[PDB]
Design a protein around this ligand. Structure first.
Ligand SMILES: Nc1ncnc2c1ncn2[C@@H]1O[C@H](COP(=O)(O)OP(=O)(O)O)[C@@H](O)[C@H]1O
Ligand code: VO4
Ligand SMILES: [Ca+2]
Ligand SMILES: [Mg+2]
Ligand SMILES: [Mg+2]
Lengths: 772, 151, 136
């Protein structure tokens, strides 16, 4: 439209294209290659690669139909002739290498990580997307958000966006832009991310800012359709990162912020020396982070605590408890050759700890080396309960922190409906995978299957309900299993859960008790295979997850699931001086949180966002077709599009339909279900492009977009006709005024011509002369 | 009909006279002419039959005029239903209101725009008034405009 | 009073004080004042009166001239019909525009002849004073 605001948003296409020569042939580097057939031979087709101009043969049933240049960089792929893994991957990759990272796949959106900042989220751009219908303007995440808003409003129901993808794809970035968007069409909300991310994110090999907890944030709306409140829910924070961090990875962001000197004044409040590589608990893996300024992030994090409305004590309570942790791990120990129970190796660092937590350093190390009926602990039983304490504190801090930020957001204002956003942590496969991962992965599964249900299983059901016409289609997309292998009655977790309650148990009775139940009785469970990546640590079994095969090491899974902190120290801290400090298995508990989340989701009109990691190098604008293609597979994109083209994804309640499309045949409207029977009848609408329904109308694909076309047109005309009416009124109003002047001018014109000709009369001349 | 064509005649004069009497009218006025005989065509409408964007462009006799009016007759006129419908799409409350500011926007900004003058005009004519919140019952307004300058 | 003048006039014009106006009567008085008409002018100037010019056929042709015209009130209004604000003055560019190319368009001469007299001072052309001048 010439609008500068569309530089990396609007698509910028002819000849050399034979619909019978040109096709898609499998490739190892690119996934699919542009080929031109040369010679058939039963099944052995011989094609020529357009790129290098090399030649090869390919089974006839392995050729894929290419799409005509007509659909270059298409905005909506459901509109393409061919929706196959090679047409899709080509369209995306086409757009992507041109700045366009958003593309509709039918009813849901696709976001391909840019790995660079784009001027597409400005307020300039937000202005243009407001109240726009998806077909009206380029593909964008705003459109997805803007539309969910309109639906909640007009349809009067809760909306929801499940933003999925792999780890490092764009789940978080996009979740934030959605809220930032909905917020712009407030300040504290936006500001809750900086603090939650500082405490629940960390550098990882995959992500320099990896989210380590699940986030579900609901945004409430009032009777005028404006933001009237908001709440946050979090899930499974990586208690383990606190004390441990695999190489090339960092602990949570805060710890590094705290040792930078962004606010020197605080150094003495926390008792920290501005050196991170000084504290064991946070210098195991990485220290710095290409493109993360811990100095400035600390400042902004501090700045954000203020805006959130945190008293200075409150926000210093936080900072201290977390700096305290930086010390729990500095407390050295020793034995004393004899019994070993264990003795300390100083007390300097163990005091700073008791100090910051407002408890007696004495009473501490005491209830830590001989927990009370007493029961002394050896030299490791201690260093490990130290960690048990660090982890458990941090899990309470993070939980309290969220409760508090909700205090600041649960405005008691009036709520109608809401729009939730789900960002759960995604699939990740590392050199070594343990309980933490199974938990994240089980989580991510889960979700995918939701999309499968609501997308295929679901669609057809409604067709039945309404009582239309149709024949089933098996998209063969179910993971209930994988899901089942892990969650069901005798599943993996259930086995582990019943294994914890036994003090006798160990890493081998658990490992054996596992094969005992699923080896050969469930094909998803398979003995550990062979290395597909160097440094591949131990593996005890493998699981075939939607997006990958994961070799899991079950060592230490029993303690990891049954937590354990000296019930003694919990007494010390129970009555500590600091006011903050003073204030079921994990598996079962989480399984339950998750089930509850899912339950909350189902009651929604979901809009899906699909994130995609372009490559394994973290560098921008570079594509790895294999990987890409691979995602376009385990995510169900293609199928996700077939039904949009195949079936009838629209649906309208006659009540809301009559109200919006009456203005298209009003000279035929004298019951909402018959009125529409009329309108759509008047329009002489093809029985094909639509269907009956008991309570709702079903319009084939695109048709509704086209009805909003005709809808506008009429609305524009009518507006003109009333302007015409106003033009005609004003004219006719000044009609008297125009008869009078027509006469009043003829007087003057005829009566001056007289006095003019009378002076050109000799007689009069001479007369006038005599006068005196 | 005759009494009809006579009416075209009547008005044709008042006009052909004002842009210099000579038995010809500036095609740029063909609109206003018909707007006087009751009808309210749309600018899109008028140009379709012969109207022009500017004066001077061209003048027309009564001979060529007859069909322009035959034309602008068969063209659609907006009913009360239609004006009510369209105006509803700007009412979030649903209670027949709108603000001055917005109404102004609809007239001046959407559809075949209307100068800012014609607006303050018809406002003052129909004597449309806003309340304390600065809102107006669009139902009343539509009724007046529909009414005529002399009801 | 229009008559009272006519007579006293006919008197000054009827030089040879014979109660009649002759080619010599006209020629006579004209010259005593300003340039006078040529024979042809004087000839057709009289032929305008069927028979001898007594003070009767005189008042006859003069009255039949000034006949077919309206009021000083009727005209002063056809004017105030463009004087919206009721200021009793028309803006010169306006009036000139009206007469010049509107209705029964005037011509440059009609235009010059008309404004050569017109009372315009300060941009505004006083149609009152000018309605009088053109009338009584
Ligand atoms: N739309 C985008 N624009 C710019 N960078 C982005 C975009 N989406 C993702 N990224 C980049 O990818 C990184 C990982 O994205 P993120 O949303 O944190 O992934 P996850 O899906 O794991 O939440 C971000 O820190 C940023 O560098
Ligand atoms: O890396 V992400 O855990 O935010 O999927
Ligand atoms: Ca004319
Ligand atoms: Mg994230
Ligand atoms: Mg004589």
């Amino acid at each position: 439209f010439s609008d500068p605001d569309f530089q990396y948003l609007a698509v910028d296409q002819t000849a050399a294209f034979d619909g019978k020569k040109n096709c898609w042939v499998p490739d190892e580097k690119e996934g699919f290659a542009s080929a031109e057939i040369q010679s058939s031979k039963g099944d052995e087709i011989t094609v020529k690669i357009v790129a290098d101009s090399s030649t090869r043969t390919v089974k006839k049933d392995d050729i894929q139909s290419m799409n005509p240049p007509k659909f270059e960089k298409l905005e909506d792929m459901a509109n393409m002739t061919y929706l196959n893994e090679a047409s899709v991957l080509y369209n995306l990759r086409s757009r992507y290498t041109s700045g366009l990272i958003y593309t509709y796949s039918g009813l849901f959106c696709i976001a391909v990580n840019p790995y660079r900042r784009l001027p597409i989220y400005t307020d300039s751009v937000i202005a243009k997307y407001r109240g726009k219908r998806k077909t009206e303007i380029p593909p964008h995440l705003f459109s997805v958000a803007d539309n969910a808003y309109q639906n909640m409003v007009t349809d009067r129901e809760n909306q929801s966006c499940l933003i999925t993808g792999e780890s490092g794809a764009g789940k978080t970035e996009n979740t934030k832009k959605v809220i930032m968007y909905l917020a712009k069409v407030e300040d504290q909300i936006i500001q809750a991310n900086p603090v939650l991310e500082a405490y629940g994110n960390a550098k990882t090999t995959r992500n320099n800012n990896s989210s380590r907890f699940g986030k579900f944030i609901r945004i409430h709306f009032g009777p005028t359709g404006k933001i009237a409140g908001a709440d946050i829910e979090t899930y499974l924070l990586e208690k383990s990162r606190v004390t441990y961090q695999q190489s090339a990875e960092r602990n949570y962001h805060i710890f590094y912020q705290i040792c930078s000197n962004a606010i020197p004044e605080l150094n003495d409040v926390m008792l920290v020396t501005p050196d991170s590589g000084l504290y064991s608990f946070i210098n195991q893996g990485c220290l710095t982070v290409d493109n993360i300024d811990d100095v400035e992030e600390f400042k902004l994090c501090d700045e954000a605590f203020d805006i959130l409305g945190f008293t200075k004590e409150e926000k210093q309570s936080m900072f201290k408890c977390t700096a305290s942790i930086l010390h729990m791990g500095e407390m050295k120990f020793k034995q004393r050759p004899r019994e070993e129970q264990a003795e300390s190796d100083g007390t300097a660092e163990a005091e700073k700890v008791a100090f910051l937590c407002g408890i007696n350093a004495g009473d501490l190390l005491k209830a830590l080396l001989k927990p009370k009926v007493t029961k002394g602990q050896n030299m490791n039983q201690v260093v490990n309960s130290v960690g048990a304490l660090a982890k458990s504190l941090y899990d309470r801090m993070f939980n309290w922190l969220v409760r508090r930020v909700n205090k600041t957001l649960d405005t008691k204002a009036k709520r109608n409906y809401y729009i939730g956003v789900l960002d759960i942590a995604g699939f990740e496969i590392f050199d070594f995978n343990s309980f933490e991962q199974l938990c994240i992965n089980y989580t991510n599964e889960r979700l995918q299957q939701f999309f499968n249900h609501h997308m295929f299983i679901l669609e057809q059901e409604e067709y039945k309900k309404e009582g239309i016409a149709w024949e089933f289609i098996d998209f063969g997309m179910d993971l209930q299993m994988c899901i089942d292998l892990i969650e069901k009655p005798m599943g993996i977790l259930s086995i582990l859960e019943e294994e914890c309650m036994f003090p006798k148990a160990d890493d081998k009775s658990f490992q054996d008790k596992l094969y005992q139940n699923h080896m050969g009785k469930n094909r998803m469970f398979t003995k550990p295979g062979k290395p597909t990546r160097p440094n591949q640590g131990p593996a005890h079994f493998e699981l075939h997850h939607y997006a990958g095969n994961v070799p899991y090491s079950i060592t230490g899974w029993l303690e990891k699931n049954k937590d354990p902190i000296n019930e003694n120290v919990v007494a010390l801290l129970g009555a500590s001086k600091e006011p903050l400090v003073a204030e079921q298995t994990i598996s079962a508990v989480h399984r339950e949180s998750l089930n509850k989340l899912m339950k909350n989701l189902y009651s929604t009109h979901p809009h899906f966002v699909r994130c995609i990691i372009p490559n394994e190098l973290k560098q921008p604008g570079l594509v790895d077709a294999e990987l890409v293609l691979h995602q376009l597979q385990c995510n169900g994109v293609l199928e996700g599009i077939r039904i949009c083209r195949k079936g009838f994804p629209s649906r309208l309640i006659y009540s809301e339909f009559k109200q919006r499309y009456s203005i298209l045949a009003p000279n035929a409207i004298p019951d909402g279900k018959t009125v529409s029977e009329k309108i759509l009848a008047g329009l002489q609408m093809d029985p094909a492009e639509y269907r009956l329904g008991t309570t709702k109308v079903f319009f084939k694909a695109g048709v509704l977009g086209n009805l909003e076309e005709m809808r506008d047109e009429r609305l524009s005309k009518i507006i003109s006709m009333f302007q015409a009416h106003i033009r005609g009124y004003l004219i006719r109003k000044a009609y008297k005024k125009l008869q009078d002047q027509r006469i009043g001018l003829s007087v003057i014109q005829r009566n001056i011509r007289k006095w003019l000709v009378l002076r050109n009369w000799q007689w009069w001349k001479l007369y006038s002369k005599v006068k005196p | 009909s005759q009494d009809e064509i006579d009416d075209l005649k009547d008005v044709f004069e008042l006009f052909d006279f004002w842009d210099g009497r000579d038995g010809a009218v500036d095609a740029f006025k063909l609109g206003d002419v018909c707007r006087c005989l009751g009808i309210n065509p749309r600018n899109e409408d008028v140009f379709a039959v012969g109207g022009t964007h500017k004066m001077g462009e061209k003048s027309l006799p009564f001979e060529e005029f007859l069909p322009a009016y035959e034309g602008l007759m068969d063209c659609e006129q907006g009913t009360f239903a239609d004006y009510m419908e369209a105006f509803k799409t700007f009412d979030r409350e649903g209670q027949g209101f709108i603000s001055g500011a917005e109404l102004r926007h609809v007239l001046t900004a959407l559809g075949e725009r209307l100068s800012d003058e014609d607006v303050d005009e018809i406002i003052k004519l129909t004597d449309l008034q806003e309340d304390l919140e600065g809102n107006v019952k669009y139902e009343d307004f539509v009724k007046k405009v529909m009414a005529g300058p002399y009801p | 009073k229009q008559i009272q003048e006519m007579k006293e006039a006919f008197s000054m014009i009827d030089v040879d004080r014979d109660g009649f106006v002759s080619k010599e009567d006209i020629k006579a008085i004209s010259e005593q004042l300003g340039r006078a008409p040529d024979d042809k002018e004087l000839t057709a100037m009289l032929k305008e009166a069927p028979g001898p010019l007594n003070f009767t056929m005189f008042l006859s042709i003069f009255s039949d001239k000034l006949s077919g015209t309206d009021s000083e009130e009727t005209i002063r209004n056809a004017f105030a019909m463009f004087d919206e604000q009721e200021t009793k003055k028309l803006n010169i560019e306006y009036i000139k525009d009206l007469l010049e190319n509107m209705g029964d368009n005037f011509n440059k001469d009609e235009m010059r002849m008309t404004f050569k007299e017109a009372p315009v001072e300060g941009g505004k052309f006083d149609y009152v004073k000018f309605t009088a001048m053109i009338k009584g």
